[PDB]
Write a protein that holds these residues in place. Structure first.
Motif, PDB file in Angstrom:
ATOM      1  N   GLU A 177      12.550 -57.938   0.029  1.00  0.00           N
ATOM      2  CA  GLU A 177      13.179 -56.873  -0.190  1.00  0.00           C
ATOM      3  C   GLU A 177      13.105 -56.243  -1.515  1.00  0.00           C
ATOM      4  O   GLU A 177      13.670 -55.204  -1.826  1.00  0.00           O
ATOM      5  CB  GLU A 177      14.527 -56.543   0.628  1.00  0.00           C
ATOM      6  N   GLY A 178      12.963 -57.150  -2.278  1.00  0.00           N
ATOM      7  CA  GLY A 178      13.084 -57.018  -3.922  1.00  0.00           C
ATOM      8  C   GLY A 178      14.512 -57.299  -4.248  1.00  0.00           C
ATOM      9  O   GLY A 178      14.781 -56.884  -5.516  1.00  0.00           O
ATOM     10  N   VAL A 179      15.494 -57.940  -3.495  1.00  0.00           N
ATOM     11  CA  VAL A 179      16.660 -58.475  -4.149  1.00  0.00           C
ATOM     12  C   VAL A 179      16.660 -59.433  -4.930  1.00  0.00           C
ATOM     13  O   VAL A 179      15.547 -60.326  -5.082  1.00  0.00           O
ATOM     14  CB  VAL A 179      17.785 -58.566  -3.113  1.00  0.00           C
ATOM     15  N   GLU A 180      17.525 -59.668  -5.875  1.00  0.00           N
ATOM     16  CA  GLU A 180      17.578 -60.474  -7.071  1.00  0.00           C
ATOM     17  C   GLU A 180      18.371 -62.088  -6.690  1.00  0.00           C
ATOM     18  O   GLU A 180      19.431 -61.855  -6.188  1.00  0.00           O
ATOM     19  CB  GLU A 180      18.369 -59.796  -8.325  1.00  0.00           C
ATOM     20  N   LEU A 181      17.802 -62.954  -6.988  1.00  0.00           N
ATOM     21  CA  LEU A 181      17.877 -64.409  -6.231  1.00  0.00           C
ATOM     22  C   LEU A 181      18.406 -65.128  -7.642  1.00  0.00           C
ATOM     23  O   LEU A 181      19.529 -65.887  -7.276  1.00  0.00           O
ATOM     24  CB  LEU A 181      16.508 -64.865  -5.772  1.00  0.00           C
ATOM     25  N   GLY A 182      17.734 -65.384  -8.429  1.00  0.00           N
ATOM     26  CA  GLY A 182      17.945 -66.104  -9.784  1.00  0.00           C
ATOM     27  C   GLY A 182      16.921 -65.717 -10.960  1.00  0.00           C
ATOM     28  O   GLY A 182      15.842 -65.298 -11.014  1.00  0.00           O
ATOM     29  N   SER A 183      17.658 -65.819 -12.257  1.00  0.00           N
ATOM     30  CA  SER A 183      16.980 -65.667 -13.434  1.00  0.00           C
ATOM     31  C   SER A 183      16.372 -66.743 -14.310  1.00  0.00           C
ATOM     32  O   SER A 183      16.751 -67.816 -13.983  1.00  0.00           O
ATOM     33  CB  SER A 183      18.140 -64.869 -14.505  1.00  0.00           C
ATOM     34  N   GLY A 184      15.452 -66.191 -15.002  1.00  0.00           N
ATOM     35  CA  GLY A 184      14.543 -67.455 -15.647  1.00  0.00           C
ATOM     36  C   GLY A 184      13.770 -66.684 -16.937  1.00  0.00           C
ATOM     37  O   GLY A 184      13.916 -65.669 -17.137  1.00  0.00           O
ATOM     38  N   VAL A 185      12.982 -67.501 -17.558  1.00  0.00           N
ATOM     39  CA  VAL A 185      12.213 -67.407 -18.624  1.00  0.00           C
ATOM     40  C   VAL A 185      10.753 -67.605 -18.364  1.00  0.00           C
ATOM     41  O   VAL A 185      10.578 -68.884 -18.190  1.00  0.00           O
ATOM     42  CB  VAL A 185      12.721 -67.727 -20.166  1.00  0.00           C
ATOM     43  N   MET A 186       9.924 -66.726 -18.226  1.00  0.00           N
ATOM     44  CA  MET A 186       8.633 -67.150 -17.995  1.00  0.00           C
ATOM     45  C   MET A 186       8.005 -67.362 -19.768  1.00  0.00           C
ATOM     46  O   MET A 186       7.863 -66.242 -20.265  1.00  0.00           O
ATOM     47  CB  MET A 186       7.755 -65.925 -17.254  1.00  0.00           C
TER      48      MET A 186
END
Lengths: 19, 146
Positions: B29-38
């Motif tokens: 759905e495009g909902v936000e799950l968890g943040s990170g650095v690529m």
């Protein structure tokens, strides 16, 4: 890390032709 | 292609770094799950996050790598750390990721740094991935007698 059902992007360059 | 270096420390990573990109993993759905650095580097792709394990993908596993409006995504076979699946991430710089990926993926990085011992060494035979194969040629017919 969510596993999607299909690719969300229509514009793509295919880099590696190996498995 | 680019260049430049300096003997300066970094107190934090910005949202606009030339080799790191702040990203957020998203669902169907495009909902936000968890943040990170690529992180993009001549060795491979790497995700950095919380006290959880870090996650890696070699460019060899990236059969395809795509970008859209604020969206970055990649496909990967059963052979990698995470297994078979597509992983998508919201990012304000998804096109700059896509423009840098192809710069490293065209480069191939052939032993560019001295790696440790790895299972590519000579040893006993085992189940191991096969190379490309040629397309088989077409057969020809024949005429008929009286």
């Amino acid at each position: 890390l969510f596993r999607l059902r299909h690719f969300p992007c229509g514009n793509v360059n295919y880099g590696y032709q190996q498995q | 292609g680019s260049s430049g270096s300096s003997g300066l420390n970094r107190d934090s990573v910005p949202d606009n770094h030339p080799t790191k990109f702040k990203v957020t993993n998203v669902d169907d759905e495009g909902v936000e799950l968890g943040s990170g650095v690529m992180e993009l580097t001549q060795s491979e792709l790497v995700l950095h996050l919380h006290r959880r394990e870090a996650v890696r993908w070699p460019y060899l596993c990236l059969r395809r790598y795509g970008y859209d409006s604020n969206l970055f995504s990649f496909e990967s076979g059963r052979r990698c750390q995470t297994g078979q699946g597509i992983f998508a991430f919201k990012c304000s710089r998804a096109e700059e990721i896509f423009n840098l990926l192809q710069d490293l993926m065209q480069c191939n990085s052939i032993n560019v740094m001295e790696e440790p011992v790895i299972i590519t060494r000579n040893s006993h035979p085992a189940e191991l991935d096969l190379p490309r194969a040629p397309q088989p040629p077409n057969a020809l017919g024949y005429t008929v007698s009286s």
